[PDB]
Structure 1
Amino acid sequence: TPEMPVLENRAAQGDITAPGGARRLTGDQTAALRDSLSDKPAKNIILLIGDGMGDSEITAARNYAEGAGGFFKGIDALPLTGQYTHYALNKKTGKPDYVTDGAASATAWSTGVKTYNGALGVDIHEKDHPTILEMAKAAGLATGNVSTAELQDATPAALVAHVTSRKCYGPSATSEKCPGNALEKGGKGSITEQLLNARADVTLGGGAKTFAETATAGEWQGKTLREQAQARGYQLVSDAASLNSVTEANQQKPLLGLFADGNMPVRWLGPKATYHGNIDKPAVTCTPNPQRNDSVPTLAQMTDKAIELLSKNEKGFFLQVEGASIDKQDHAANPCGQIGETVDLDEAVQRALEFAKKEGNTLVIVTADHAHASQIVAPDTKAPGLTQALNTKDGAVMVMSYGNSEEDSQEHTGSQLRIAAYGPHAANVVGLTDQTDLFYTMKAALGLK
C-alpha cells in the first residue's frame, strides 16, 4: 500500500529562539513508525551512496544550504535510521583494518564479504564472489549503475568487476597490476572489459577516456573498447540531449552513457581551505561552477532517466546511484565543492523517493561507504590544518576544518555512520549493523537466491 510515509517536514517548527521553536517533531511517531514497517517483498531497489558522506558531511551541507534548523527534502526524509560499521581487512593477517577505502567497502555491500583495501569483487584470498547486480540480472530483473565518477572508479566498478587492484582500469594497467586478471593471460579482463561483459541495462557516468584503449586479446582484439561497445549493441550517449532521446534500454539495447573524459565536473566553486583561513581570510560564498557545460547531465537528471527506462521491466529493477565527488572534494579540502555535491545527491534522492512513494514496492537506501576528514568547528578556531569560513543560509558564519593529513590529500576516517531507508524491509537498517548486512538485506528483499 502507498500508505508507508516518507518524512514530510523535519525542519524546525518555528522561532528557534523561542521554547519549542527548534522542535522538528510535531507529535508522536509511534504510529507513523508502525506504518513504515513491512516485510512484504520489495519489487525494486534503489541504493544511493554519497561517497564519504559521514554525518559530519551531511550536517555541514545542511547548515550551509538550508541553515541549521533546515531539512534535506531527500537526504533527511527517510523514516528509518541506524548506524553501520565499515572496517576493512588486512590482506596478510586477515585482522581488521579500521579505515577502509572506496574498493573494500563497495565490495562489502556488493558481495557480503569483507576484503582488503584496493580489491574489487574478490575476498582476501583473491577469490571472486558474485555481486548483487550480477544476481539481479540472473533472476531476470533489470539493472542500472549510475555515478558522477569515472565508471572505472571503485564504487561503480565493484558491481561489475572482479580484479585484485582498483588500479586496473583498462587493458594496459591490468597487464601490469592484475596480471592474473589480464585478458591475454587468460583473465576475465580489465575493469572496463568486465563492465562491457556484465551488460547491465543502464550504465551512466564518466570515464570515456579508458574506453579509448584497444583490447589485447579476445574477439575484439585490435578494436578500442568504444568500438567494441558499439560492436556489441550498446547505445552510446555523451550529453543530455542524447540521453533524453533514448526510449529503451534492455538486454538487446543496453544504454551506455559516457559524459566526461574523467570524472564529471562539480556543481559549485569555492577556493581551497587554508592554514588559518578562517581567521586571515574573509567568509566565502559558493558560486556555480563556470566549467560545468550546460550539456553534461546532472545526477538527478541521470537518476530520473534511469528509473524511467528501468521501470519498464515488469519483473523489477536494481539501481545504484552515487554522488561521487563529496569524497573527492573532501580529499581536496574544498568546502564549496563538497557541499555542492551533497546538494546534488539530495536532488537525486528526491527523485528516488518520488518514484518510491507512488509505486509502493521499492526499497530506497541512502548512505556512504565510509566517513571522511571534514569537521564543523567554532569560528574563532586556531587549527593546525586547513580551515575556511562560509556564509550559511542562516546568514551566519560556519567554519570547516580538514586536519588529519599534512599531505596534499585529506584522509578518510573510520567512525560508524548513518544508514537510512524507506520501504519494504527497511527495518533491517535500524540499530547497529555492518556494511555487509546491507548485501544481505537487499538480496532478501528482492528474494534472490
Structure 2
Amino acid sequence: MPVLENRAAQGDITAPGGARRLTGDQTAALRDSLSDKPAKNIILLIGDGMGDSEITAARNYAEGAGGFFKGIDALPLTGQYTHYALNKKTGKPDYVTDSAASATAWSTGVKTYNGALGVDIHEKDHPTILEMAKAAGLATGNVSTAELQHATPAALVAHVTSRKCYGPSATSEKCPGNALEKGGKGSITEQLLNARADVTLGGGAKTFAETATAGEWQGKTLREQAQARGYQLVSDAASLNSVTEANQQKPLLGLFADGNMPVRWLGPKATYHGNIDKPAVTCTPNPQRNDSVPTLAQMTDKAIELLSKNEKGFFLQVEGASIDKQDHAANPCGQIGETVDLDEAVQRALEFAKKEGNTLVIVTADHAHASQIVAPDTKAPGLTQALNTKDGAVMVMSYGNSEEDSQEHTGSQLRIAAYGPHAANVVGLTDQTDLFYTMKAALGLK
C-alpha cells in the first residue's frame, strides 16, 4: 500500500500542465491501497478545528499554493464526514459541535450533547475505543499538546456530564454526580488515572496538583496518587527519551506544561482591517517552544516506540490541539504553525505504518472553524491579517463569525483521510460515529 510520495504542482504553474499534481492515472495505485485484512494497530491523528480551510491556509503559507504537506496530504483515501451534535433537551441535531461532543462520537460511536464526555444525552456512560482496546489486551496511547483534561484526550478515558470537570474542585461543583465524595467515578483527571493507558503525554500538570476529596488517596495530590499507583512520571524531553518501557505494570504519564504546551510560531492577532491598515506578517518561531519541551512529532515517535513492543497491537490517538485554540484567538501564525507541527507528527506515523504494514492511520479533525482565506483587498467586518507566503505573495485570512473574544467553530463537513487496512471506510460521505465502528472493526474488537 503506497503513500502519496508527491502531489505538489509538477512544474511551472504558469505553464500548461505545470500546476498538475498527478503524473498519470491513479486507478492502479488506488487498487493497491484497498485491503480488508485486519489492522494490528491504529494511529488516529486529530487536528482540533483543522477543517479544509485550515489545511489550505497552512499549506499556502508554509509550502506554497502548489506545495504538498508530506504527512497531511499524503494519505491516499480521502472522504468527508459530518460531526453535528445533539440538543440535550430535544434530541434534535445541534449543527455546530464542541470538542467534547465530537470526541465522544468517535470514541464511543454515540452522538451526544455539547460539553458531554463519554456519556449520551441521558448521561449514560459508554465504553470508549481506548477502554475497549485495553480490555482486549492491546497497548494504548493518548498524546496531545493541550492539557490532558481537555475534551479531545479526556474523551478516551473519562465519563462526565460536563467537560469543565477537570479535577476534584470543579467536579464537586459542576459534576456532583461524578464527584468522588458523592459516590461518582471521579473527575476527568481522576478517571484518567484509573483508565491507566500505557502512554499518556501532554500538558495540564496544574490540575494534577489538586488533592482527592475521598477514596484511597484522599488528601494526596493527584500527582502523588499517580506515583503511588505506579505511573512513571516524566516532565521533559530528556526524561521522556530516557523511558525504555511503558506498560500496565509501569505506565507512563508525561506532563510537559502546567497548561497547554507552547505554540511553535508567534505572530500578532488579526485585527479589524488589518490587511489594509497594516503590513504583511511573517511568522516567527517561538523562542519558548524549547529544546526541553518535546514536539508533537517527538511525542508521537516515543509513543510508537513504546507501544509497538506489545505483540497484540496498539491504539494511539495523537492531537495537534492548539490549531483550534489559535483559530479561536484569531492568530494566523499560531494556527498555521500548529498545523505544520501536526504534519510532522503525521509523517512519523506514516513512516512507521508504511514499514509495519498492518497499521491504519487516520488524519482528521473534530469540527470545522472560523478562518477563511479571502482576497487581499477584502474589507471585512471581522478580524483579518495579510501574510507573506512561501510563494512570495500575500494571503489574507479572515475571522468573521464572532463579535466576542473567541471566534466560533463552524459546522461544515470536513476532510477525513486514511492509509492502511480498512482505510476504504473513510471514503465518500460518512459520519463521525462511523469512525468508532471502523476502528473497532479494523481492530477486530468485540
TM-score class normalised by the smaller sequence: over 0.9
What do residues 9-32 of structure 1 show as CA deviations (whole Å, max 9, x unaligned)?
000000000000000000001110
Where does residue 291 of structure 1 map in the other structure? 288
Of the structure 1 ranges 288-297 and 17-26, higher mean CA displacement relative to structure 2 is found in: 288-297
What do residues 379-415 of structure 1 show as CA deviations (whole Å, max 9, x unaligned)?
0000000000000000000000000001001000000
What do residues 336-361 of structure 1 show as CA deviations (whole Å, max 9, x unaligned)?
00000000000000000000000000
What do residues 224-259 of structure 1 show as CA deviations (whole Å, max 9, x unaligned)?
000000000000000000000000000000000000
Distance in 1, Cα, partners of 2:312 & 2:288: 41
If the length of structure 1 is used for normalisation, what is the TM-score?
0.99
One of 271, 275, 278 as aligned partner of 2:272: 275
Distance in 1, Cα, partners of 2:123 & 2:68: 43
- What's the offset of the Cα at 1:291? 2.2
Tell me the SS of whatever aligns to 1:145: strand
Tell me the SS of whatever aligns to 2:306: helix
- What's the offset of the Cα at 1:209? 0.3
- What's the offset of the Cα at 1:268? 0.2
- What's the offset of the Cα at 1:293? 2.5
Distance in 1, Cα, partners of 2:109 & 2:226: 30
Structure 1 residues without counterparts, runs of 5 or longer: none
Tell me the SS of whatever aligns to 1:106: helix
Tell me the SS of whatever aligns to 2:214: coil
What do residues 83-102 of structure 1 show as CA deviations (whole Å, max 9, x unaligned)?
00000000000000000000
Where does residue 306 of structure 2 map in the other structure? 309
Tell me the SS of whatever aligns to 1:318: strand
> How many residues align structurally?
446
Where does residue 251 of structure 1 map in the other structure? 248
Matches within 5 A, 1:283-432: 283-432=280-429
Q: Which runs of 4+ in 1 moved over 4 A?
A: none
Distance in 2, Cα, partners of 1:106 & 1:341: 19
Distance in 2, Cα, partners of 1:291 & 1:19: 45
Tell me the SS of whatever aligns to 2:272: coil
- What's the offset of the Cα at 1:294? 1.9
What do residues 25-46 of structure 1 show as CA deviations (whole Å, max 9, x unaligned)?
0000111000000000000000
Distance in 2, Cα, partners of 1:320 & 1:143: 8
CA RMSD of aligned residues (A): 0.4
What do residues 98-128 of structure 1 show as CA deviations (whole Å, max 9, x unaligned)?
0000000000000000000000000000000
Structure 2 residues without counterparts, runs of 5 or longer: none
Of the structure 1 ranges 283-292 and 232-241, higher mean CA displacement relative to structure 2 is found in: 283-292
Distance in 2, Cα, partners of 1:405 & 1:231: 46
Distance in 2, Cα, partners of 1:211 & 1:84: 35
- What's the offset of the Cα at 1:292? 2.1
Matches within 5 A, 1:32-431: 32-431=29-428
Distance in 2, Cα, partners of 1:81 & 1:408: 34
Distance in 1, Cα, partners of 2:287 & 2:87: 42
- What's the offset of the Cα at 1:290? 2.0
If the length of structure 2 is used for normalisation, what is the TM-score?
1.00
Tell me the SS of whatever aligns to 1:309: helix
Identity %: 100
Distance in 2, Cα, partners of 1:304 & 1:82: 26
Distance in 2, Cα, partners of 1:293 & 1:24: 36
What do residues 315-335 of structure 1 show as CA deviations (whole Å, max 9, x unaligned)?
100000000000000000000
Tell me the SS of whatever aligns to 2:346: helix
Distance in 1, Cα, partners of 2:27 & 2:289: 45
What do residues 257-310 of structure 1 show as CA deviations (whole Å, max 9, x unaligned)?
000000001000000000000001000000011222221110000000000000
What do residues 409-439 of structure 1 show as CA deviations (whole Å, max 9, x unaligned)?
1000000000000000000000000000000
Distance in 1, Cα, partners of 2:88 & 2:8: 45
